[PDB]
Every structure is written in structure tokens, then in C-alpha cells.
Symmetry: D2
Subunit: 199 residues, 4 copies
Amino acid sequence: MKHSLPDLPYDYGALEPHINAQIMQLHHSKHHAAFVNNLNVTEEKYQEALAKGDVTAQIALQPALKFNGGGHINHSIFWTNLSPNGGGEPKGELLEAIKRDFGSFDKFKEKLTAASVGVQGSGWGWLGFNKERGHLQIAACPNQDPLQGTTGLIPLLGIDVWEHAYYLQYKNVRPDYLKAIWNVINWENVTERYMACKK
Amino acid sequence: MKHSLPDLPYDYGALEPHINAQIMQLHHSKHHAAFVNNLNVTEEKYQEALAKGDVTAQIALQPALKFNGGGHINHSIFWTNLSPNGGGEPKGELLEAIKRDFGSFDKFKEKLTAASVGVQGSGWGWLGFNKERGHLQIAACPNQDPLQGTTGLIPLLGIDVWEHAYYLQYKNVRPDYLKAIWNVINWENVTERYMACKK
Amino acid sequence: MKHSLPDLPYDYGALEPHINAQIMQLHHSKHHAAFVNNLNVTEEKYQEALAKGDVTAQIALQPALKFNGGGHINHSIFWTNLSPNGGGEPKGELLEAIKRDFGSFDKFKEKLTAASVGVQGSGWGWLGFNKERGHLQIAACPNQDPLQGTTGLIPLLGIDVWEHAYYLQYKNVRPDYLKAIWNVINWENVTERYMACKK
Amino acid sequence: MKHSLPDLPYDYGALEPHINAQIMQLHHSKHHAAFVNNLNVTEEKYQEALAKGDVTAQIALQPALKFNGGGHINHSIFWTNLSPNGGGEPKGELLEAIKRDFGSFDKFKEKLTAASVGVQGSGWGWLGFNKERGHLQIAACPNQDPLQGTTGLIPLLGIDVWEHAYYLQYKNVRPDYLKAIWNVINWENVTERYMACKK
Ligand SMILES: [K+]
Ligand SMILES: [K+]
Ligand SMILES: [Mn+2]
Ligand SMILES: [Mn+2]
Ligand SMILES: [Mn+2]
Ligand SMILES: [Mn+2]
């Protein structure tokens, strides 16, 4: 199929001052681009191995596939979760679900911040939808392990806590980044993803 | 391409009294048969996901692929590593490599037994060949993780320490099984695998 | 402080025909006994390493501590989760929570069975209580990884799917064991653990 | 015992232009300092749990202990592995061992670079000594998992490939960092660590 790097839905500087333009440009044009390129190389090798019945080769390719495939999945969602027009609080049924499942919007922010701050090493914090239980759920994922492929939860909002997501601007202080990012959450997109889950 | 269950190269009772016939029949005709069938099912699902560029589906299939594919890889080697004509010590260049890399055959036996006894949960102990270093090497693998796909070492001799490999006969006493298995190691096969590495 | 092997609260043959006496005696008097003894050995080594500030030694002991400590935690709960007086359905608030969180008791049984059947290698299926969300939750754990220590969920009902839990009687057919075990679930104990959570 | 942040054996700018002073200052005074502080907090909680026989609490503390304890172990070695007076090639028996085990010094550099470049996510590349085999060995470790505590190999030379080790200067281009770091390897320290392994 040949995966492609999706265009960013805004200018690299559109999320300033919360995420600076240098980070956005590196994150999209270098990090995400590399995931796409390496995913395409890995998928081609997997097709060769499947055609030959080389199970050893398939298994040896799994780390690169999950890492670059997961990186592509996660970053593709991440870009749509952010917006220069973002921030504030969601409305409608998503806000109702947040209050129901987490108590309040403020308590939800505390819980998702805590999950994202708690990642040791590289990883992601997620607000997801549990289809079987029919409610929201917070989870963390290591490295580039993607939410749906590894947990079954449908991703609604992801917070990248790899050092490349914040280090140039916030250095070691991940909590300052986690506080800033709330100003650019695209609740319109998160709402669209949530509504798609229900019926 | 479709993987197939290899026939056992000897009678189910050929390894008695070291591994009883009930274990051999269950291990081959039930456990390995399930791995092969589930591998073919997983590979077909992966081919579909690859054709659609569904990376989430590919990643969700990785555990089943490594588990069932590794199960097929490991057990296919295992049956050839055992023989009613086995036991004793290897000869020729394999024996020389064992003495060179481990000090003696007895010291090698201690190291492979220790790796196999040390597995917590299900897994395998392996004598492998390190192609880059050009020498033998011992490693342990969890569950059905196969040696070459996860470490790059070429498998020479594998010891299955899943409970289904010994429990009916030896119950919880894994060391009794490890002591018995040395009497049925097919050093002719281990030598063939070793000589193929040095080509 | 020294951990001790709890006596089984019933006869080794009390769960027949669902779990035979040979399994119960081996499972308790051999498998659990080894976990307790190895836990005490590991804890003593950890106390020495902590006193010396030997972080390398502490980290090297982590696998044995989680394996044997988890083994002790899990099996101590497991014996109380089973009873000759078991089977049937729970009553009162636990039944209400099951219907509320899973739809029905039968749907809950399907979800916990699926989690337990889905374990690849050794592990456990759990019904737990999520304190932060205030509701029930199903999770699976690998090897002897204990539920609360690794997920934060409070354990209510655990299903051991290590091969030593069923192999002598059910051989490779784990689903037959899972079908049988429902006849001996001690819902009185599961209810007590649940009520302690809502205090 | 109360672990302490070791003084750096040189000025924060002593490794320029290969690793800039801002990185060295953040890496030591923020990242390593945090590992030490969090290690001390975690060890105190572990002492409490050991005194109470709370195995659940001990296991829940394992991730923080390995992460911060491993971070302390790894960075303490890393600082001594570098020097403004470094670079070039080792001499004496260490050089003899490198030629013997890897073919040449240049081939060793290629192998350690490849292991360090190959880390997906956060981690480390290591040249270690295998006491049982009596020879050098290259390995990679994820996150802050320390070499000796998780593999048994004695650390000789470590290459930190966490993004915070290079990102401010080299951005996403880890290979440029891996090339530059060879100019500051303190082969006198690596030789001391190697000689300590033999007899
Ligand atoms: K016979
Ligand atoms: K009875
Ligand atoms: Mn990222
Ligand atoms: Mn097996
Ligand atoms: Mn058990
Ligand atoms: Mn570092």
C-alpha cells in the first residue's frame, strides 16, 4: 500500500508558545518521516518472508514493525488531536462522559497528566474508549506501542512523552510540557473520535 | 506456502524410560499440531492486514505470530534434537568447540542445565551458534520466543522446559527431567546443525 | 517477618471431580511451598543488598522476587477463591456490580474465561476491583506477576492457567479446565473481598 | 546508605565539541540527580515494605527501583568512561582482547555503534566482559536496565542513547553523536575496568 507521511493540519508554528515550531518541525519532518520510511521498508521485508514461509524472518522483523508502525499510528493521531484553535474544555456527550467516568474535567486532566508523567522511558499517555465496557479509560503505552493494537482501546487523545516531544523547549521538565499542552487540545477532533465509537 | 506438522522421526515410546509415550504423543500430536494450525491462521490474517496497510491489525497479530510461529520453529527443531539413538557425547569438531568455548563437555552440560532450570514460567534453554563471533553460545528464551528470530543465534540444541514437556512423568521436579533428557540428545543432529554453520 | 505456607482450607480431594486430588496436593504442597521458601530466601538477599546499597544486587533479585512473591500472593488468594461449597452465582451487591459492569453474570463468565484462555504461556486471569474508578475490571497477568502489584487492581477472583493447574487431569485442553472450575468458585470469599473494597 | 550524585570528573564543557556543555550539565545535574533522589525515596519505601512483609508493595516499587537504580548505576559508569584527555585507541591487553574478540579496533567500533544505533526507544549500548566465558561481549539494554544486574556482564564502556544524551546538539541524528563520542572515550578507565575483571 505504501504508507505516506500525512500533512500536518496546521503550520509548524501554529502551536506556539506551548510547543515551539522547532519541535513540531523536527517531530513531523524527521521523526514521523523516519517511522513512515522504515515502516515501508519493514513491510516489504515482511511480504518477502511471508511468501517464503520464513517465520524466523517474520519474528525478527517484529520489533521494527511495532516500533515504526506504532510510531506512524500514534503520530498520525497526535497531529489531529492538537490545533491552534484548541484548548478549553469539550462539550456535549464527550464532556458528559468525562464527568461520568472521571468525576470532573479537572479530575480527568489530573489523571491523564499523572499517567503521562508516570511513563519511565519513552512512551505515550492515552485517553481511550473501551468498546466492550462502553466507557472512557486512561492507559499508558511504552515506546511506540500503539493503543488499539496492543490494548484494544480506541484512541481518543494521545500525549507523546518521548523526550523529542518536549526536550528542546522544556528540557527535563516534562510536567511543564504536560501543563502547556492543554492549551492546544483539539476537542473537536477528540469529540469526533468519541462519537465514532458510539454506534 | 502452508506450514505442516512434521511427523515424529521415531515411535512415541522410543524415548522411554526418559520421556514417556504419553508425553511424546500429547506434545507432538496436540501441542505442536495446534501451533502449526494457529500459525497458518495467523499468517493468513497478517497477509490480509499487510494488503490493506492495516498496521493496527498487523501489530495486534504479533503475539499470536511469535507464539505459534515460535512454537512451530522450536518444536520442529526439538524432535530432531532427540533420538532413541542419542545420549553420550558428541564427537569431532562439535566436541572440540564445546571444550574450547565451555571448558569441557560436563561444564557445558552444567551451563545449559542451569539456563533451562532458571526459566521462570514457560520457556526453552538453547545451545546456539553466534555467527558474528564464530563460536557457541548458551541462551534462554521465554514462552515460545524462537532463538534465531529473537537473538540472531543459530539453534543447535533446544531443551523445552514448558510444563507440558515433563509434568505427566516428573511432576514439579524439573531437574529430574533435565537429568533424564541428556540420555536422548541426538548429537548426530546437533553436529549436522553445527557443521552447517561453519560452511 | 517470615512468610508462611497457608494450609489448604479443605481436603485435597474436596474439589473432585472438577480438580482432582493429585493436582491439589502437588499444587499446594509442592508448587506453593516452593514459592514461599524461595520468597523468604529472596527477601533476605534483598535486605542484605539494601543494607549495603548494592543496587546491582537489588535489580538482579527483582525477577525472583516478583516470581516467588507473586507466586505466594496469587496462590494464597487462589485457595480461598475455591471451595467444595462453591459454584453457582454470587448474590447481593457483587452480583449487582457484575450485572452493572459486564451486562450479566454469563457475559462476565465469558470475559473472564476469554482472558484466561488467551494467556500464552503461563499466567492468570483476574476479576479485580478498580479503586479509582469504583468498578470491577478483568485483567490477565503473565507468569506469577500479581494483580495489585503490577496493575493496582484489587484481586477478587483469580484463575490459574499455568499447566500445573490442570494438565494431569485435562492435558492440553485448557477450556475443559475452565469449564470445570466454575463449579468450585467460592463466591462467599469473592464477595468478602469485594465488600472490603467498598469500605 | 543514602546514594549520592557523584561529582563529574571534569568540567561540564570538557567534552566539547563532541558533547556540548548544556547537555553535560543537564545530564548530570538534572537527569542523574533525579535518579539519585528517586532511588533514595524508593529504597526507603522498600525498607518499609520489607519490614511489613508487604510483597505487593515491594513488587509495585520494582519499576521505579530498576529505572532510578539503573539510571544511577549506568550514569555513574558513563561519566568515568569519558574524558577530555580521551579518544584514540586503547593499548595493552584491552587492545589485544578487542582484536581477538572482534577482529580489529575498527570492527569493534562498527559493532558497538551498530548496537547503539539499533536501540529503539531509550537505552544503552555496552561493551562488557563475560566472566564465565572470559572474553569481551557487546550488548544493548532498554531504558535504564543496567548491564550487570540484568545480564551478568561486567560493564566496561557504555554509550547512552537516550535522546537527552544527544538531542539538544544532534537532534534526531543519533549516528552523528555516535561518531563524535569516540573522540572522548577514556580508554584509561575502560582498561582499568577490564584489568579488574581478569584475576
Ligand atoms: K519402547
Ligand atoms: K472427595
Ligand atoms: Mn513522538
Ligand atoms: Mn513444548
Ligand atoms: Mn499455580
Ligand atoms: Mn542518560
